[PDB]
Amino acid sequence: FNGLTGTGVLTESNKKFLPFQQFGRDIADTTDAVRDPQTLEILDITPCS
């Protein structure tokens, strides 16, 4: 997603991303959500394995 390379399952999320907010991070500074550039819906990431 727009250079945000990452392996993991993408699933629809219930987050409340503000319009300016784009990525969405967590405590460990690891991207756990992305706002899709095509559709403004957000998708959270769960690692596989």
Partner: protein, 49 residues
Amino acid sequence: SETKCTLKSFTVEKGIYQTSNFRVQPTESIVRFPNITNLCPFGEVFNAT
């Protein structure tokens, strides 16, 4: 067999063993870029006089 490989032994005692992941996670790839379509100015940078 996963448990046996985790312990590096061919015999396994009785109990609970937390097993390491010897499995194949990934399936495919997805690339979602913005739709912007116009060539970048490069002839005026490299081919300029």
